[PDB]
């Protein structure tokens, strides 16, 4: 149970909820055909668009509760350690990131991390005290984007609609960069099926641990947009 609440740009904390579209609480989205899968059930929405230079290291921050109610980094914050799963980031080019609706956008995936050598993306999130990082590709066309960030908790993913999606979106303005557009985009809803192998999945191994029995973990959604 966690909430996406700030972005950092090369280490610079952009501000609590600045430029973020956020839910009212930490409850997961479980219906991949719901419009809530796009940016969550958004109830908090500002006019700010964050400046992100192409190539910048971008941080996104997750907290168990909003702001000071999160408490210190511990067993529940940023997320319980049982909530193993991937963490992803997508973008969608828009006209104005402060005013765009979220229906019918063309999303492409810019970062992902899953399971590797017994460690989940979530474990890195915990080690980095709630921050997850990616590099904004240097070749991407400048301008207005919505940035969707996602963590999927898989501790109950064995049953249909058991996967817990923690999601939000950030309003951004990419400066510098290049002229790349993704050749192939995906929709939300649409990109995910409730029976995808990285969504309907029992991650518990022979000794009852979240090791996916050592099998490859197939991150949901499209291939990465690359430079
Ligand atoms: Zn939880
Ligand atoms: Zn706590
Ligand atoms: Zn709690």
**What is the DSSP secondary structure assignment for residue 41, as one 8-state letter?**
S
**Distance from the alpha carbon of residue 76 to the mean position of ligand 1, in angstroms:** 8
Retrieve residue 112's tokens.
Answer: 């992902």
Residues 6 or more apart whose CB falls under 8 angstroms from that of 193 comprise: 32, 199
The two beta strands, 42-44 and 20-23, are antiparallel
- Classify 122 as helix, strand or coil: helix
Which residue in this structure is represented by tokens 């029992």? Answer: 202
Q: What CA–CA distance (Å, rounded) separates 155 from 202? A: 8
DSSP 8-state secondary structure symbol assigned to residue 15: -
CA 37 to ligand 2 centroid distance, Å: 26
Question: Is 1 one of the annotated binding-site residues?
Answer: yes
Please indicate if the annotation marks 60 as binding a ligand.
Answer: no
Provide the 10 A C-beta neighbour count for residue 38: 27
**Cα(178)–Cα(181) distance, integer angstroms:** 9
Look-up of token digits 């940035």: 147
Q: Tell me which ligand sits closest to the C-alpha of residue 153.
A: 1
**Residues 170, 46: Cα–Cα separation, whole Å:** 10
Tell me whether residue 166 is annotated as binding.
yes
**Dist CA 3 CA 169 (whole Å):** 11
The distance from CA 220 to its chain's CA centroid, rounded to whole angstroms, is 12
Q: What is the CATH number of the domain that holds 210?
A: 2.70.50.70
CA of 31 to the centre of ligand 2 (A): 28
Determined by which method?
X-ray
Instruction: Dig out the tokens for 131 from the structure.
Output: 């921050």
Residues in the chain: 227
Tokens 């022979």 -> residue: 206
| Helix H or strand E encompassing 126 | helix 121-127
What residues pair up with 169 in beta bridges, in sequence order? Answer: 21, 148
Closest Cα partner for 6 from 201, 128, 226, 170? Answer: 170
Strand partners, 132: 60
What is the β-pairing status of strands 50-53 and 164-175? parallel
CB 7 within 8 A of CB 59: yes
Kindly state the DSSP code that residue 184 receives in the 8-state scheme: S
| Closest ligand by atom to 122 CA | 1
- Residues facing residue 62 across a β-bridge: 4
Domain range for 225 is 1-227
Structure tokens at 41: 């059930």
- In terms of phi and psi (left: phi > 0; alpha: psi -120 to 50; beta: otherwise), the region of 98 is alpha
Short-list 22, 18, 23, 21, CA closest to 48: 18
Residue 58 near residue 114 (C-beta atoms within 8 A): no
DSSP state of 140: B
Structural tokens at position 205: 């191994």
Starting from the CA of residue 165, give the closest ligand. 1
User: Rounded to the nearest whole angstrom, what is the distance from the C-alpha of residue 122 to the centroid of ligand 1?
Assistant: 12
Count of structural domains, the chain: 1
Taking the centre of ligand 1 as the mean of its atom positions, its distance from the CA of residue 79, in whole angstroms, is 6
Beta bridge partners of 58: 9, 134
How far apart are the CA of 102 and the centre of ligand 2, in A? 32
Distance from Cα 130 to the centre of ligand 3, integer Å: 15
In eight-state DSSP terms, residue 29 is B
Residue with tokens 């991949």: 32
Residue 60: its H or E element: strand 57-63
Query: Is 155 labelled a binding residue?
Result: yes
The answer on whether 64 is annotated among ligand-binding residues is: no
Give the span between the Cα atoms of 187 and 223, in whole angstroms. Answer: 14
- Residue 50, beta-bridge partner list: 172
Strand pairing report for 143-153 and 164-175: antiparallel
- What's the resolution in A? 1.9
Task: Please tell me the distance between residue 118's alpha carbon and the centre of ligand 3 in angstroms.
Answer: 26
Q: How far is the CA of 118 from the centre of ligand 2 (A)?
A: 25
> Omega into 189 within 30° of 0, i.e. cis?
yes
Contact (CB, 8 A) for 155 and 211: no
> Degrees (nearest 5) of the Cα angle 136, 140, 143?
95
């Amino acid at each position: 149970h966690t909430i996406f609440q700030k972005v950092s740009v090369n280490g610079a904390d952009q501000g609590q909820l600045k430029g973020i579209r956020a839910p009212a609480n930490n409850n997961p989205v479980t219906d991949v055909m719901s419009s809530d899968i796009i940016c969550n059930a958004v109830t908090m929405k500002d006019s700010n668009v964050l400046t992100v230079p192409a190539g910048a290291k971008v941080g996104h921050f997750w907290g168990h509760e909003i702001g000071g109610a999160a408490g210190p980094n511990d067993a529940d914050n940023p997320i319980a350690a049982s909530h193993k799963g991937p963490i992803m980031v997508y973008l969608a080019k828009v006209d104005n990131a402060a005013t765009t609706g979220t229906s019918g956008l063309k999303w492409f995936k810019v970062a992902e991390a899953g399971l590797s050598n017994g460690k989940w993306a979530v474990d890195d999130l915990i080690a980095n005290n709630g921050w997850s990082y990616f590099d904004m590709p240097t070749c991407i066309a400048p301008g207005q984007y919505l940035m969707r960030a996602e963590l999927i908790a898989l501790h109950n993913a064995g049953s249909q609609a058991g996967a817990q999606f923690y999601i939000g979106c950030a309003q951004i303005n990419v400066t510098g960069g290049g002229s790349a557009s993704p050749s192939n985009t995906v929709s939300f809803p649409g990109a995910y099926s409730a029976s995808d192998p990285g969504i309907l999945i029992n991650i518990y191994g022979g000794s009852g641990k979240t090791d996916n029995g050592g099998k490859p973990y197939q991150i949901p959604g499209p291939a990465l947009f690359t430079c």
